[PDB]
Amino acid sequence: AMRIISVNVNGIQAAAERGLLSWLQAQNADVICLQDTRASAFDLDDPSFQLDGYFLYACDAELPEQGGVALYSRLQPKAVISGLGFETADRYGRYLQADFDKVSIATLLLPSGQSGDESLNQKFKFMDDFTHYLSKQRRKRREYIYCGSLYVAHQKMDVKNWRECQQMPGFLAPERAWLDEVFGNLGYADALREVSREGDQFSWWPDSEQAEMLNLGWRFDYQVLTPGLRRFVRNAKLPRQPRFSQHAPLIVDYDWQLSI
Amino acid sequence: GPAMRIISVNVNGIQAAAERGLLSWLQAQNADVICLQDTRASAFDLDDPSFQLDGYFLYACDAELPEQGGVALYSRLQPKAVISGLGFETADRYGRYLQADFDKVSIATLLLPSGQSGDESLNQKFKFMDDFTHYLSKQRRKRREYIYCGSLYVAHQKMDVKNWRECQQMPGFLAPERAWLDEVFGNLGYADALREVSREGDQFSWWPDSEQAEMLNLGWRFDYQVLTPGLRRFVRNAKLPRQPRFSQHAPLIVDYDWQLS
Amino acid sequence: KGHSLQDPYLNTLRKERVPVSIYLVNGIKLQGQIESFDQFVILLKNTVSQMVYKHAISTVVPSRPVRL
Amino acid sequence: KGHSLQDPYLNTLRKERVPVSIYLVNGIKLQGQIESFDQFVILLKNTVSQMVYKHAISTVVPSRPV
Amino acid sequence: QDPYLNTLRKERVPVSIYLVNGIKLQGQIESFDQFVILLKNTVSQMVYKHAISTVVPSRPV
Amino acid sequence: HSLQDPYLNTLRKERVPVSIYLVNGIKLQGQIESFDQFVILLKNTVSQMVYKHAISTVVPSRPVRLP
Amino acid sequence: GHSLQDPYLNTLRKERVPVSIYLVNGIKLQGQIESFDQFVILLKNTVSQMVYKHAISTVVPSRPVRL
Amino acid sequence: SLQDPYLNTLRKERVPVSIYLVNGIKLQGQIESFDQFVILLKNTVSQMVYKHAISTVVPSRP
Amino acid sequence: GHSLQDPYLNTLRKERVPVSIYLVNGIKLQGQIESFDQFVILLKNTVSQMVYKHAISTVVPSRPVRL
Amino acid sequence: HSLQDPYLNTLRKERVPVSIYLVNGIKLQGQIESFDQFVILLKNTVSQMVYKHAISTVVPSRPVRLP
Amino acid sequence: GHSLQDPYLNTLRKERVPVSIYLVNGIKLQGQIESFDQFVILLKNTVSQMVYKHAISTVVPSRPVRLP
Amino acid sequence: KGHSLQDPYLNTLRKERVPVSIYLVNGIKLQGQIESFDQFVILLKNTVSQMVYKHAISTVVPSRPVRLP
Amino acid sequence: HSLQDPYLNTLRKERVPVSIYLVNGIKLQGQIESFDQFVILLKNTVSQMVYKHAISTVVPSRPVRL
RNA sequence: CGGGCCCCGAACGGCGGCCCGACAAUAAAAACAAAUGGAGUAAGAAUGAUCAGAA
């Protein structure tokens, strides 16, 4: 087995009050990649967030409310690294990576880009910087699993009424083109769309009860994995959890097992 | 804009060209670098501040005897590094090569022995050609891109020479010269800027002394801008102004969109 | 083989011994350098030799720009 | 003979330098431009000079009509 | 092999081709050869013979 | 040469309802109308031309005896 | 050429050894080879489905047989 | 072709090789015999495979 | 000699500023500084591997620290 | 002197299976047999001497605490 | 010892010339020389990066400097 | 300068005529028997007398284990 | 030093064009301006200092005697 | 030992001469965390002024 959980909690505190800690504790998994901690590493040090039988790793942004990402693993990773050299990355700890034998996973959290124009500019900046870094991450032997919420949909199949969202951030032409270039040209794939080419599957919908009723979801979570692991995809699922997190948990299993 | 102008001029003696006004014309003619060839003057002669143009850095590697050969190179901004060696007796002892270094590009002034003088000159030309194709086979390994300002004294194809049926005896269009040049432009991958921009005839770069050939345009395209296949797509425009000619060769100006640094 | 554009490419990849990244149809990637080739096989020297088949190669991405 | 229709189409795409998107049999989209081609190989120029074997090319979609 | 596809092309029958990867292609047959089938649908979406699994015409011929 | 052609000719003459499965595993159905060295015509509501290089196996819905 | 697969398959057929042909898609095919020829092998399944060589990948016998 | 030298060398030295198929499943075992069409692995079961669905043959030891 | 390296490394270790070491081979490291001495240094990370000084190329702290 | 000798002595005493990576990138394995101011003997199946100027770093397989 | 190093290095530091340091493997660094000693050099760049002497290959300044 | 392990180890490998396999820092495998060693050089006896330098050697891998004094 | 110092001094005297090769395998052209126990000055456009431990060999462009 | 080269038979075989198997040398890459699941997955053109299809 080889499970991976992705829950952009948008605040580990709200996650705790919503019962995310108990759900993850009950949810038997190998690695858990929650995003947007909205708290300092010292806050994550609170044993309440420490899941029984899992390690604690977290990198906080310069400003807690800005972001922050954490990573829980069942076995001691070979090494944990944070940052990518970019200001938009280092100054906010939006990237944290653990190292295991043969495969090393990472936790990515892109800026929403929907708050303001400056957020969209930062999004474009981080996108170009990240595709550059990944170009530098081509011939690298170690296979990767960039588990992160990219705040962008690849195809219309990933979001309904695209006609209305075409101009709204998250589905704009340049972001979709960047994602397509990152996926196809560079040989990267996705476990879900590979194992299950089924529409209507989303992760992030408005907290508004109306959108939840009519299910206005935007697929923002993606299990970006190097082509080496593409062959070892078991199955993907997007549970419709009752408002536990804006980004619904993204659980995927893999045929390839892990090792220290 | 991100324009890069390179001016290659074979003067056959900088003295005559300067007398005809090449120095002032170049000083006025904006250009990033000038690939002036065939100086016929020593480095100490080029050291004369009269040839040294303001706003440029002069670099030249003369031969053992000035009039025999000699090549120089101008540069508006200080190049990263300049090298004046090739490893051949036909090259080092004759200062026929001088290469500068830039950001991912290498401007190189090249001057092959004419060969039209005597049979010994033809033998020297064959020797230099084989040594230089060997050097090119060795250089293709290098990742950094290269530029070669070179008056090769060899006609490439029919369009690159008038009345080739008659010129098939004159050095420049000979069968072995043609083979060598097309192999350089062929298997070795190197390309030309003029042939890339304008596949139009009547474009020559050398004429005899008799004004009859000039009027009839019985000339050869002995000047080339051998480009590494990389910048081939980045060739903007090229021209061969025949009227403002200051020697048997004509000034060959090529402007690119690539920006050095 | 009539035009044989693959032959010059493989020859320049082998002569310079450039690091190649031969992708396969299944999805795995094979790092190394082309030691030799024929009609249906290519030799990748990565510590040990690899008899990667031709019909299984999806794309060949050399990590080193090869002028030609 | 074999490429009486493939050869002219690919040659036109090359001469016109139309940005094409090659879809592999594996389903991986490959955007770029056709640099050169032959009997069973096509050179795609992009950020990385790529060589895609014909036998593993499912479809090609030029971005503009030709 | 040749006559069937030639009739499909000349008669301008709406064809839908399922590739070996399963992709349901749609379009009209423009021109075909030993190892190529030009599918005319907005763009000249060329399709190789080795990758075609089934050819589903909209009506029999 | 000695087995494929007679088997397919018998399946065609007897018009046995065969079930063909593609290399990918997609299950198809229909009768064998005509055979070819490179392709086959499977008439099932709408005649679909299937390529031989994409045929995994040929499952006849009824047992068949060779001649 | 083709001098090795012929005797191997002929021996597998003669002794009627249960082979498990694993297709390229990862599907099991337990049965006995009834016959074999070019571009075709004939299983001894309840329906005796005809398989194609291009699709076949491996031919493992449940019991190790001698050459 | 260089395939036959490689294969017969592995056969003579009987090096444990790991063969990857077009699907990607990793096989293991020595090579007993081989021709142009098939390979006869020396595995516990000696699973025979045709040459039209091979990816890469690699020896576990140099 | 070695009058500047000592205070720099001592401050980096005391403040436990996460540093990223880069080996001469081009390999990168991460983690705080555990200890240091002549020809040897100890890295404070998930694993406390011992790195020799003669193989280190650069010492880049995550956040610029003051000497 | 102050930190290298105790660390190496503890590694040798505890006989922890360590995997040393050379500056060239080669991966080695084995137990620590003995060390010196210029050389270290690593025993894996057969004793393999390694020089101190050719090691990138020492990675103990188990966390260790200095004395 | 080092009769020629210290003058050149302290002159570069005084003039605060943006120098480009080339390492043994080929990668090039950039930044003004902040401080140095017998074995390490500090770059005033935003990263405040420190580089060891035994790993540095060449120190090429961006502009010619006068010898004191 | 006054070590303890290198000298006896190399002397034993020389006397016992053990086929030694030396690893260079470049990653090339040298094969041969130890002829004689010094503070800075090791002579590898393999048909030709290759004078391999100490600082260029990465590891000394003998073909068979040897007892230690 | 025994021989390296006389050789470098002779090269500096005539300012002979030398080619210094680093351990990585690259060659640097120019002429020696000065040297010491650990560094060598190779003047060429800019004064670039190179360390001894990183140099592999000094090859003069033309024949020179001690 | 086995790869690259030329030599020779009748797009197709193969044999001798050899060389190498550590690149007579990248003006330099803000950095390579270290080199068989298996009896088979295919939801709807905002509308041809009008389609008979054979031994």
Residue numbers in the entry:
A (entry chain G): 0 to 259
B (entry chain Q): -2 to 258
C (entry chain W): 3 to 70
D (entry chain V): 3 to 68
E (entry chain U): 8 to 68
F (entry chain S), J (entry chain D): 5 to 71
G (entry chain Y), I (entry chain M): 4 to 70
H (entry chain X): 6 to 67
Could you share sentences copied from the article?
The widely occurring bacterial RNA chaperone Hfq is a key factor in the post‐transcriptional control of hundreds of genes in Pseudomonas aeruginosa. The structural polymorphism of these ribonucleoprotein assemblies enables selective translational repression of many different target mRNAs.
The estA 118 fragment threads through the assembly and contacts all three Hfq hexamers and all four Crc molecules. Hfq1 and Crc1 are flexibly tethered to the translation repression complex and were excluded during local refinements. Focused refinements resulted in a 4.1 Å resolution reconstruction of a sub‐assembly of the Hfq:estA 118:Crc complex (right inset and EV2E). estA 118 is presented by three Hfq hexamers and adopts partial ARN motif engagement on each Hfq distal side. In the Hfq–estA 118–Crc complex, Hfq3 presents the first longer 5′ ARN motif to the Hfq2 rim side. The Hfq2 rim side residues Arg19 and Arg66 form hydrogen bonds with the exposed N‐site bases C‐28 and U‐25 of estA 118 (counting backward from the AUG start codon, with A annotated as nucleotide 1). Indeed, disruption of the ARN pattern of this Hfq3‐binding site in the estA sequence resulted in a decrease in translation repression of the corresponding reporter gene by an order of magnitude in vivo (Hfq3mut). The proximal side of Hfq2 coordinates an estA118 hairpin‐loop structure (hairpin 1). Indeed, removing the prominent hairpin structure that is recognized by the central Hfq in the estA 118 repressive complex (Hfq2) promotes translational repression in vivo, suggesting a somewhat antagonistic role for such hairpin structures in the assembly pathway.
